[PDB]
Amino acid sequence: RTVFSSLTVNGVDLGQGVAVRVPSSNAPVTDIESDDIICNTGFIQPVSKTVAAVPAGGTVIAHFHHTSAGYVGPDPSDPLDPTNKGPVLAYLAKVPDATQSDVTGLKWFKIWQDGYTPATRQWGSDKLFINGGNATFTIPSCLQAGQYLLRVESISLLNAEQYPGAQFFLSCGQINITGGNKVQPVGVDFPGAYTSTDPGIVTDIYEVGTYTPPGPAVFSC
Ligand SMILES: *[C@@H]1O[C@H](CO)[C@@H](O[C@@H]2O[C@H](CO)[C@@H](O)[C@H](O)[C@H]2NC(C)=O)[C@H](O)[C@H]1NC(C)=O
Numbered sequence: 001r002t003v004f005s006s007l008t009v010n011g012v013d014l015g016q017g018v019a020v021r022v023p024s025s026n027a028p029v030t031d032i033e034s035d036d037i038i039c040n041t042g043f044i045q046p047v048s049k050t051v052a053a054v055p056a057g058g059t060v061i062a063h064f065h066h067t068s069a070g071y072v073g074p075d076p077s078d079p080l081d082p083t084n085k086g087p088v089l090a091y092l093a094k095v096p097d098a099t100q101s102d103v104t105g106l107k108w109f110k111i112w113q114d115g116y117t118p119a120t121r122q123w124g125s126d127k128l129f130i131n132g133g134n135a136t137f138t139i140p141s142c143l144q145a146g147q148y149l150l151r152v153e154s155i156s157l158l159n160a161e162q163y164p165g166a167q168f169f170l171s172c173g174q175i176n177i178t179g180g181n182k183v184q185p186v187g188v189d190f191p192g193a194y195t196s197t198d199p200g201i202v203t204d205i206y207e208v209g210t211y212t213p214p215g216p217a218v219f220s221c
């Protein structure tokens with residue numbers, strides 16, 4: 001189990017819970033047809049009204065830890081339980097106001113993922129564990145400036161040999177992309193993008209040879 005609960009932007013730490021809608025527990029979302037698949041559920045109140053200014057092309061760290069508290073010292077399952085093999089993914093959606101409570105009917109484009117490397121038997125979850133929960137990626141430099149939600153997701157496939165089984169640990173960050181250009185990428189729906197026929201969601205990790213994470217191709221400028 002794991003929770004995304006803080007951000008670093010171009011090396012500046014914003015603070016625990018700042019500009020992130022932090023779910024109250026580290027319980028997974030398991031229903032890919034639920035609106036809970038968009039940004040999780042049951043947020044710690046009051047929800048942050050910080051919207052992080054991020055230049056297009058800038059480097060962001062989405063911080064995962066075992067619990068919604070963030071870092072509370074040594075813990076063998078911090079940032080996640082290393083037995084929980086699976087991918088890590090990051091998506092953006094353009095939103096009128098990054099503090100708005102309604103997150104339905106947005107168009108999500110994938111900006112980064114780390115799946116599985118067969119030759120080394122290493123999963124994105126392993127890399128995230130090694131990096132102390134630091135999921136690090138860049139914001140595409142060509143994007144239209146404005147308010148966006150940043151959906152960052154860790155999937156455990158330990159029990160994913162049937163659906164339901166995959167465990168989805170995710171949160172949404174609140175950002176304001178500055179600079180940039182005029183590109184407005186095509187996005188997918190949440191719910192909708194993930195289905196029970198996706199081999200990225202139904203997978204036996206003890207029978208895996210090749211692996212493709214669920215959802216659309218990564219967007220690049
Ligand atoms: C993950 O990122 C964190 C947050 O940026 C890193 O911790 C910071 O490290 C710098 C320099 O080492 C310190 O000056 C900061 O005070 C740290 N931040 C906090 C909140 O304490 C951390 O090193 C990264 N972990 C890994 C393994 O890369």
Ligand SMILES: *[C@H]1O[C@H](CO)[C@@H](O)[C@H](O)[C@@H]1O
Pocket residue numbers: 010057058059060138
């Ligand atoms: C943000 O910073 C990272 C370095 O941590 C760069 O690799 C990236 O190009 C962006 O400048």
